[PDB]
Design a protein around this nucleic acid. Structure first.
Ligand SMILES: [Mg+2]
Ligand SMILES: [Zn+2]
Lengths: 163, 190, 202, 52
RNA sequence: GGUGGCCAUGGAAGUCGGAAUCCGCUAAGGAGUGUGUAACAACUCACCUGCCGAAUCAACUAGCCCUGAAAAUGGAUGGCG
């Protein structure tokens, strides 16, 4: 990419959000996608197969360019997994009682959530992120018969196993 | 409430020699000599510093609104000192969409001659005050330089041409043309 | 906020002045909030960066403890943005050297510092003619095919002399990035000692 | 057409103004009070409208 | 920053609107005062720093004057003042 219009591989990053099935309403990326040798349709519908077999409730979506190859990975977002940690999937055409539904445990699955929080956090080790991603709630409301409310004060686990 | 005392010392540099005739301050440095009368304001101007180091303005049986003025005299004196040491320079950059404002100084300073502001046939003329040497700049395109010793005189004169150049019956949000002040500074900086 | 929360900070500074005898005085003049987040995690094995305000002139009140003395030599340096970085494992320079990351660089008109600045007679690579920042001063240049060269060399500005605005802007156009030393290190304290970054100190 | 720094000079002098809601008198950006005796020195100020 | 947070998608990733709604880095930064932006950004403001040196600020309430306050043969604190 540099004095004159060069490249030298294609290993260039682009990130997208949102996802029903895929797209397709005379639309996908454009702007970044078209000049880049990608398309709007084949590299759209191959974004189905990988962002599929269950994602249908908004996604984050890194697409890596290689010549004209668009790699369709679903990189997990902290609230997206906590929406998919739900008593899950009702999907579309009802839904209707809406997405403020809100009752889901994640007792050690938030441990597995704060585990898969890959790098991002620049972390004090669990016992603080456990509280960061525990505190970001609105749907669920903490562990079987509790509220996030009173986990924040304490967490008698994780701490010295994650370092 | 009357305040028994308020005062302020101006620190006078080694270059300059102020000498106050009662209340009337005269200032001579390198550049020239200035004068001004504080035959209104009513204060006590002492020159206490020997060799010659301090102007001190008193104020004395003064209520709030005259206590103000202690500091204002104190200012027009610094403002003189800066004028007679350094000297001031207001720059003013002409501005437009379209018709080139076409300036031409015409005795020495004095006549600042302006064709074509906004296609207008009437050639605006503007006098400077005495001691104000206008001049068209270089090292920049549409830009005047008003040099003088006296702030008072140099900035009416900016404002005279800044105000002579005003649009009428328009959006002056849109019609942003005319000549206006970009930079108040000095001739010599030190 | 702030008769209790104040009196709280006081107990955490007085702690690290006792427990932590190695003190690194750091200048963070240019900094980002995402920058420090990363510097604390890049040095998590080692150091403890401590950021306060004016109150840092409360070394007096730990020195008041009918106790410590040489904390008088810490007095002249609590001024003009400063924080300290308390560390157990120090061990001299060798962790101090690996801290120095990318940065100024910078270079501004009105500055003074480090050593004699040179621009090795190398071919620049800027757009053609672009000789006006050389022609303004005086260096022998030539268009060999397209791009520009200096076909000679010398020191542009020497130690103690001021750098002009045109000679500053030409140096940061060339990519030559000297005159700087902010967010890095100002003055170390280790056991009543007075180090000085002019150079033994490391 | 009219260079940005040049423009935002003139803007400084004709556009960023407060204005009295009583007397329509035009005031500097900082004004919390009018100048005019006529309105009764109001405080009812608003910013001058930025041209779209 | 965790962070296209949630609702809303028409865009609202801090921001036409609302439930809300809390941690990290902490220093300190509101899941945001605004500009504005389709949305951002970019900017700004809370918060917090750098530099300076001692008084500073806000809401009320009153005293005095200023405004509200506009009439017809010329013009009346009695006049002069
Ligand atoms: Mg009209
Ligand atoms: Zn008014």
């Amino acid at each position: 990419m540099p004095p004159k219009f060069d490249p030298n591989e294609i290993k260039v990053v682009y990130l997208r959000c949102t996802g029903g099935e895929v797209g397709a309403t005379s639309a996908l990326a454009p702007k970044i996608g078209p000049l880049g040798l990608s398309p709007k349709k084949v590299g759209d519908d191959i974004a189905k197969a990988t962002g599929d077999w269950k994602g249908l409730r908004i996604t984050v979506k890194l697409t890596i360019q290689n010549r004209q190859a668009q790699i369709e990975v679903v990189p997990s977002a902290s609230a997206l997994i906590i929406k998919a940690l739900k008593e899950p999937p009702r999907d579309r055409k009802k839904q209707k009682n809406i997405k403020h539904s809100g009752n889901i445990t994640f007792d050690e699955i938030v441990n597995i959530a704060r585990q898969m929080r890959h790098r991002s956090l620049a972390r004090e080790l669990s016992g603080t992120i456990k509280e960061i991603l525990g505190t970001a709630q609105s749907v669920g409301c903490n562990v079987d018969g509790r509220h996030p409310h009173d986990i924040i004060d304490d967490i008698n686990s994780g701490a010295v196993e994650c370092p | 409430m009357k305040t028994i005392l308020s005062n302020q010392t101006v620190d006078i540099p080694e270059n300059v020699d102020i000498t106050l005739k009662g209340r009337t301050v005269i200032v001579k440095g390198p550049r020239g000599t200035l004068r001004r009368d504080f035959n209104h304001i009513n204060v006590e101007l002492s020159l206490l510093g020997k060799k010659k180091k301090r102007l001190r303005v008193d104020k004395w049986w003064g209520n709030r609104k005259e206590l103000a003025t202690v500091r204002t005299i104190c200012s027009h004196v610094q403002n003189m000192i800066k004028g007679v040491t350094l000297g001031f320079r207001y720059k003013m950059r002409s501005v437009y969409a379209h018709f080139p404002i076409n300036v031409v100084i015409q005795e020495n300073g004095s006549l600042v001659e302006i064709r074509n502001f906004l296609g207008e046939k009437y050639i605006r003329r503007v006098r400077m005050r005495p001691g104000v040497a206008c001049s068209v700049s270089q090292a920049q395109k549409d830009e005047l330089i008003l040099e003088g010793n006296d702030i008072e005189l140099v900035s009416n004169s900016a404002a005279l041409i800044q105000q002579a150049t005003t649009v009428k019956n328009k959006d002056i949000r849109k019609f942003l043309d005319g000549i206006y002040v970009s930079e108040k500074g000095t001739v010599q900086q030190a | 906020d702030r008769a209790t929360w104040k009196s709280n900070y006081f107990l955490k500074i007085i702690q690290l002045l006792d427990d932590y005898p190695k003190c690194f005085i750091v200048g963070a003049d240019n900094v980002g909030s995402k920058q420090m987040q990363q510097i604390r995690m890049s040095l998590r094995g080692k150091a403890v960066v401590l950021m306060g305000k004016n109150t840092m002139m409360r070394k007096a009140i730990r020195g008041h403890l009918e106790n410590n003395p040489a904390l008088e030599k810490l007095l002249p340096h609590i001024r003009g943005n400063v924080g300290f970085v308390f560390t157990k494992e120090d061990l001299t320079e060798i962790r101090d050297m690996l801290r120095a990351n990318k940065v100024p660089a910078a270079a501004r008109a009105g500055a003074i510092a480090p050593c004699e600045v040179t621009v090795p007679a190398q071919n620049t690579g800027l757009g053609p003619e672009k000789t006006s920042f050389f022609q303004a001063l005086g260096i022998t240049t030539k268009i060999s095919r397209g791009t520009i060269e200096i076909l000679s060399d010398v020191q542009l500005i020497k130690t103690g002399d001021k750098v002009g605005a045109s000679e500053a802007t030409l140096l940061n156009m060339l990519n030559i990035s000297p005159f700087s030393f902010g967010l890095v290190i100002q003055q170390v304290f280790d056991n009543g000692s007075i180090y000085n970054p002019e150079v033994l100190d490391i | 057409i009219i260079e940005p720094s040049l423009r935002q000079l003139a803007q400084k002098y004709n556009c960023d103004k407060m204005i009295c809601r009583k007397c329509y008198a035009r005031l500097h950006p900082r004004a919390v009070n009018c100048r005019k005796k006529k309105c009764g020195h109001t405080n009812n100020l608003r910013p001058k409208k930025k041209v779209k």
